[PDB]
Amino acid sequence: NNLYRDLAPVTEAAWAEIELEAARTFKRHIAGRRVVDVSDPGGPVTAAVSTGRLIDVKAPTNGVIAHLRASKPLVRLRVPFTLSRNEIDDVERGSKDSDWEPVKEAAKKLAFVEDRTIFEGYSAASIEGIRSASSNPALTLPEDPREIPDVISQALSELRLAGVDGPYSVLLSADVYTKVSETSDHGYPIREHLNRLVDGDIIWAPAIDGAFVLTTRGGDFDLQLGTDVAIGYASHDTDTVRLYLQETLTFLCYTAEASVALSH
Amino acid sequence: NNLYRDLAPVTEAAWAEIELEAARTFKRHIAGRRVVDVSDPGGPVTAAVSTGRLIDVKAPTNGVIAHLRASKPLVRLRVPFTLSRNEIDDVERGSKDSDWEPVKEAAKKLAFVEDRTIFEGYSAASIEGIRSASSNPALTLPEDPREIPDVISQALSELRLAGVDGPYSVLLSADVYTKVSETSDHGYPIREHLNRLVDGDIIWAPAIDGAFVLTTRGGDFDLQLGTDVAIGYASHDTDTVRLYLQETLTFLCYTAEASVALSH
Amino acid sequence: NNLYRDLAPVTEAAWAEIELEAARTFKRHIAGRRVVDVSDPGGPVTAAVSTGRLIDVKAPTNGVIAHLRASKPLVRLRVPFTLSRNEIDDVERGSKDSDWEPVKEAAKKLAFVEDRTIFEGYSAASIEGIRSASSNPALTLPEDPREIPDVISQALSELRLAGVDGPYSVLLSADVYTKVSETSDHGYPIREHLNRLVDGDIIWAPAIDGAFVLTTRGGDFDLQLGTDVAIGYASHDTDTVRLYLQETLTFLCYTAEASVALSH
């Protein structure tokens, strides 16, 4: 296929450790797929997702009414990374500490771009994120982290006022997640106060800004995958192998009132 | 074998009580084997652990490229102890309080050396401990023990920032473990506050200095055993038997970001 | 694996002729494996050979006796060679005289380095050769080749005085082997006089200096192989393919009195 993995000077044993480090780092830093509906991958051919809507377009002849079918394009996101060939060759010799730091940086970079796309949008790919598509009022996060469980309760009130009924999850940015993990009250971290407000999870979301409170009842948020994360080969020289991680996706939000966005 | 146990003036009943006291005291004072991967014992022959790496070495002839295979030597750690022969002979007569205090001191001594080796290093045996091999920033322990769950939360933040994903355990030195056990807050000991920060265990580590927070996801810390703890015979006279405890091991840390070291 | 043979622009038919020329030239120029015990290859992981001995090392704590396990490192010996791609491509077209001269030079180079290592030592790899480890007195080779069977008989006397009992082989350097092959006495070459002194073989050893007389009773000389001779791929351009021969080994001599070294 287009990955051209068989052309890489990378052993089968070294691929297994690269695949492990990429999958483990990506899953650690992905927060969007824990709350959105993730489709089955459509394959390499699929290029657009039908929205079912119509666009008025000028008729080619009188007596004819013409409409373009509306769709959302998929975006191919590629993160290159460079591995040392000495570190690759050490794997068959029995090394357990080969430097897969460029794999982990690329998986963290690809996980951030996917979560920035879902929550903050990526407008060049015609992706309105959850923050922009939310019709609930955007709340402000207080600087005192002990006041955060009040504002999360205010976000849960807006979802209750909007009429949505599902288990709620709270996604926190890396700064806010740290701040509620390290600040205590009544002998409990603030993050444990937040656990008891919601039936879903308090989710570490290191890509996003601020916070999000949303329902995970299903059918509101759609991550449409063309192809999921794959590792491909670009080139190599004597010392290095140029690889990449890539995935093809788009994100669709169908319910504007299913989420509350929070920021500073 | 080399233990020469059959030459000892030690009865079978007395061996069973010596083996029991040594195993119970060693397991009580070992903290490293609760968090590191412990290999199967390689046997008495094994002398080195391959690191899989290569060392540049001068070629014997031009047109030849030579590399030494790198490895880590195992270290044989022996702790002698002396038992009274009157206490040994009392066992067959039905004594239940024979003085196995030199067994317990030797097992505690051998357990401390193993845990100092894993965590603080033993540089003459080319063993970089967990504290020296950690790439996360070293935190300072506060003198007020009620402020310890904040600094443990700061250590958990560094591991979350490093990207590692497993159940975290906290290893406390004997001074710190006592101080968080004897200080209370909200009607709970500080050690119980620490239990609720982590999904792993709060571990009494009487050999180490300060504290350690690390993941136990697996594959990061490797205790390679040549031979595990065995009791051997050295010599005897009319009144005493000279014995020893010994084990052959080395320790390897493969993941620098899998641990946070804490000290005063 | 690390050889990356599938990336080479070398046909299956051309590999078969390269493998044949490398194996035939290596076996022609190897003399050490005819007299030493050659182990089964330990695999790519193995990095050291246990000597079973102990090294005094400073104890980490009082009351503890520490010893490092001693071992001998394996050395990876690589000989690069460059083949013409026109000569490679001629093989499928039915050529029988493709220039495998760089293969034969590399196999001769790798065979010499292995035999210099066994007999003359390679001290950077901590390999004491047979000549240095021999405790028998070193004899001098006479300039008259007709006087060589006397000095070989003197070497056989030293082995008889040392008490060793096995079939003796004589290894001659390329200069000495030529000189005893081309000089005649009583209508026989001097090499045929040497054949009748020993029950083993008179062995052409083109790598070594001088001569060696040793027993092949077994258990005295140990060639420990990690991986045996393999052909790997480095790189290629339009005109050439860069390949290499490599093997990983060390040599151990266990019996100092099992050999007599001879020189000029």
Keywords:
part of a larger assembly; 3 chains; 264 residues; alpha/beta; four-stranded mixed β-sheet; 29% helix
Q: Major β-sheet of chain A, in short?
A: 5 strands, mixed
Ends of chain A: how far apart? 45 Å
Number of strands of chain A: 13
Which sequence of strands runs across the widest sheet of chain A?
5-13-10-6-9
**H/I helix tally of chain A:** 7
Measured by DSSP, the beta-strand proportion of chain A falls in 25-35%
Oligomeric category? part of a larger assembly
Largest interface, chains and sizes: B-C, 40 and 40 residues
Using only C-alpha atoms, the radius of gyration of chain A works out to 22 Å
Protein structure class of chain A: alpha/beta
Element pattern of chain A in H and E: HEEEEHHHEHEHEEHEEEEE
Globally, the shape of chain A reads flat
Helicity level of chain A = 25-40%
